[PDB]
């Protein structure tokens, strides 16, 4: 096969200038973004339950083999996931 | 009828625009661009002079006997012309494969109008908007 | 589609059937060679005939009398049929209009051919044999096959009239069992097996009246002859070596007629059209011989 | 016109050729099976009877 | 396998969504510098047709791709692409069935 | 003569026709890279200034 791709991608273009695509947005359409975050209401409120469901529950970080890394960091042991 | 580019001479595409094409027999040898008319039962030879005779130009060449396909009214076409034509021109067939003016010939009458203007021996572009037969 | 009527149960509906027309005889595939073109002209190479050596003296220069070559050209036309409804007589119809439109541009197509076949057969053939009334039965076939024989070329096929056909199976040679070696001819009429196996030939092509060109039908311009066994100077069957007339077959796409159904983008018609391009040549005419009434 | 075969028949394709050729008249060989064939040792000579 | 295909998870939604929308999923095989494999790599299946034989098999696939006012267009051999097919016509079919083609009425429907 | 191509150019053989057609003259395309392109939505407008 090939160390590069070979296929093409739309990707690419007259930068942030007067097109319409979903990558081409300027800076007027993320401040747009943070004018429909900022100003509350019923639709920011959707959006932020979104995250709370996505992301809000936390988290855990696992390293498979984790006591095999044990090793002294600072004149004491850790495992990576410790660290 | 041709086109030069360069060195090169190419044919010329007889028909600009139009479905009105319709299919006829050779009563006998004809070329691309020739006007045409009924010489027997779905049968075509070329046009004589002064009216009276046209049902379309001849879209490529063939041999006598040989089945012709035709353009009539309705398209626009490429054709050679015996003298200097204008726009808005009356044509008419020459009885030498070429047409000329209405105004040239004896009739009274066009079969096609001239669009785009040529010198004699030029090829004009021209709408074919008549059919002529025998009337006496 | 939204059908008017309704159709009941128990086949108290209506009568729902159409009674076909007369069809015509079709073999000229069979009784030819057939030839798949790649292109719509073309050229088949014929070499010159066989010649003596000549008698020469002793140490002298031996003449050139090398072979020589010539081609027949095929110029296939452009064979059509088409047909053109409206979408409401689809929908209201008592059988399928695009099934029997399809068949019959097929029928109008091959009929087509066998008159391409027909007509240069007939008219092409460089030899014949006048009957002048008379023997006009197995004698006529055997004249025939003599009289291209005569020319060092072996037929092997014949093609037949209806009235040529009536005239041979009345032909006592072939009526009589004793005369015949079988009764498949009284039986069976034409399709005896003696009847593709006489006088040398091995195979029959039995023709319809109407397919011959006689220049009456609209497009076409008639041939040189009269097709037929009825009357004095009526040409009624060819007796030929089916390996020297060519049927040439050419279609843009496939190998073989081409039907195309099509909806018209405007106008709530829907049409069904046949394309085929076919030619007929003689490879050589010698090998072939009318029987004239 | 448009583009049709009539017109490039010789520019963008060439018509075919059959690869077969078919035979001219080809006469009846029989003498070699039909006669007594000698193989004669001088171009003169005779049989005695 | 398992550590050939570390996320694949992942590339199976992807591809899988992919040929729910589109008629195929499709993409390239790629390899670290080295020559090692890399990952299969999904191409963008809207810029990519194929180019069928006479029996129905995919020969070479032709892309064209958005390019600053105009468009890219490339032709590559399917020597070293790969495609899967979700809805088809038959078994026989390699090109196969986009359902959003497929319902266009329906969604047009819906919309108005 | 003998036997020689100018005599069976046409009943032998057929002239060969090169597999590829010479494209002729091509003009330099540009303008779609040489200015800002824009995907109008409609046939008219104005554009603010
Ligand atoms: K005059
Ligand atoms: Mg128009
Ligand atoms: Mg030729
Ligand atoms: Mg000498
Ligand atoms: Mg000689
Ligand atoms: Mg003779
Ligand atoms: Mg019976
Ligand atoms: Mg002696």
Same mark, same amino acid.
């Given at each position: ?12 273009? =007259? ?69 | ?9 190419? !044919? %010329? ?17 004809? &070329?691309?661009?020739? !006007? %045409? ?29 040989? !089945? ?33 003016? %209405? ?34 | ?43 088949? !190479? ?69 008159? %391409? ?9 460089? /030899? ?79 023709? &319809? &009246? ?33 390996? /020297? ?49 | ?43 003169? =000579?005779?049989?005695?009877? | ?14 591809? =899988? ?32 047709? +194929? ?25 590559? +051999? ?35």
């Amino acid at each position: 096969a090939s160390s590069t791709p070979q296929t093409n991608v739309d990707s690419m273009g =007259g930068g942030h200038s007067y097109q319409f695509n979903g990558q081409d947005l300027t800076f007027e359409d993320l401040r747009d973004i943070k004018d429909v975050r900022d100003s509350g209401g019923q639709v920011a409120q959707l959006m932020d339950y979104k995250a709370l469901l996505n992301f809000g529950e936390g988290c855990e970080i696992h390293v498979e083999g984790d006591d095999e890394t044990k090793q002294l960091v600072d004149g004491e042991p850790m495992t990576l996931s410790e660290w | 009828a041709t086109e030069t580019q360069g060195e090169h001479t190419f !044919p %010329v595409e007889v028909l600009i625009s139009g479905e009105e094409l319709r299919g006829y027999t050779a009563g006998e040898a004809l &070329s691309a661009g020739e !006007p %045409v008319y009924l010489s027997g039962d779905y049968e075509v030879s070329a046009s004589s002079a002064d009216g009276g005779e046209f049902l379309g130009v001849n879209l490529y060449d063939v041999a006598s006997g040989e !089945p012709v396909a035709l353009a009539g009214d309705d398209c626009e076409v490429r054709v050679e012309v015996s003298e200097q034509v204008t726009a808005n021109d009356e044509i008419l067939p020459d009885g030498l494969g070429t047409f000329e003016t %209405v105004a040239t010939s004896a009739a009274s009458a066009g079969v096609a109008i001239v669009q785009e203007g040529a010198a004699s021996g030029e090829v004009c572009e021209a709408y074919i908007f008549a059919v002529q037969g025998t009337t006496a | 589609s939204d059908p008017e009527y309704v159709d009941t149960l128990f086949r108290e509906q209506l009568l729902e059937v159409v009674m076909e027309g007369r069809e015509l005889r079709k073999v000229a595939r069979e009784a030819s060679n057939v030839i798949n073109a790649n292109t719509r002209v073309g050229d088949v !190479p014929i070499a010159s005939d066989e010649e003596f050596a000549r008698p020469t003296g002793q140490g002298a220069e031996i003449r050139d009398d090398g072979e020589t070559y010539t081609t027949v050209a095929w110029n296939a036309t452009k064979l059509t049929e088409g047909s053109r409804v409206t979408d409401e007589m689809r929908d209201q119809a008592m059988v399928d209009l695009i099934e029997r439109n399809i068949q019959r541009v097929g029928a109008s197509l091959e009929n087509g051919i066998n008159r %391409v076949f027909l007509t240069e057969l007939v008219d092409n053939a460089q /030899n014949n044999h006048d009957t002048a009334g008379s023997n006009q039965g197995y004698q006529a076939l055997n004249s025939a096959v003599g009289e291209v024989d005569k020319d060092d070329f072996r037929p092997d096929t014949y093609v037949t009239h209806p009235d040529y056909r009536t005239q041979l199976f009345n032909d006592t040679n072939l009526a009589y069992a004793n005369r015949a070696g079988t009764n498949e001819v009284l039986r069976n009429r034409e399709d005896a097996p003696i009847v593709g196996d006489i006088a040398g030939l091995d195979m029959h092509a039995a023709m &319809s &009246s109407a397919t011959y060109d006689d220049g009456t039908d609209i497009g076409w311009s008639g041939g040189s002859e009269t097709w037929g066994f009825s009357s004095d100077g009526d040409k009624g069957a060819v007796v030929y070596d089916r390996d /020297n007339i060519h049927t040439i077959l050419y279609a843009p796409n496939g190998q073989d007629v081409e039907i195309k159904d099509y909806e018209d983008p405007i106008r709530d018609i829907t049409g069904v059209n046949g394309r085929l391009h076919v030619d007929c040549q003689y490879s050589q005419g010698r090998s072939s011989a009318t029987v004239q009434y | 016109f448009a583009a049709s075969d009539p017109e490039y028949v010789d520019t963008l394709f060439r018509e075919q050729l059959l690869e077969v050729v078919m035979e001219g008249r080809e006469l009846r060989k029989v003498a070699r099976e039909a006669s007594n064939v000698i193989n004669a040792n001088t171009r003169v =000579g005779d049989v005695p009877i | 396998l398992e550590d050939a295909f570390p996320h694949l998870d992942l590339l199976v939604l992807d591809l =899988g969504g992919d040929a729910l929308w589109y008629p195929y999923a499709v993409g390239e095989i790629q390899e670290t510098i080295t020559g090692e494999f890399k990952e299969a790599l999904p191409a963008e299946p809207w810029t990519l047709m +194929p180019e069928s034989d006479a029996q129905g098999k995919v020969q070479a696939w032709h892309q064209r791709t958005k390019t600053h006012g105009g468009y890219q267009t490339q032709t590559l +051999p399917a020597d070293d692409l790969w495609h899967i097919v979700i809805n088809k016509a038959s078994a026989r079919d390699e090109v196969g069935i986009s359902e959003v083609l497929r319902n266009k009425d329906e969604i047009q429907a819906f919309k108005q």
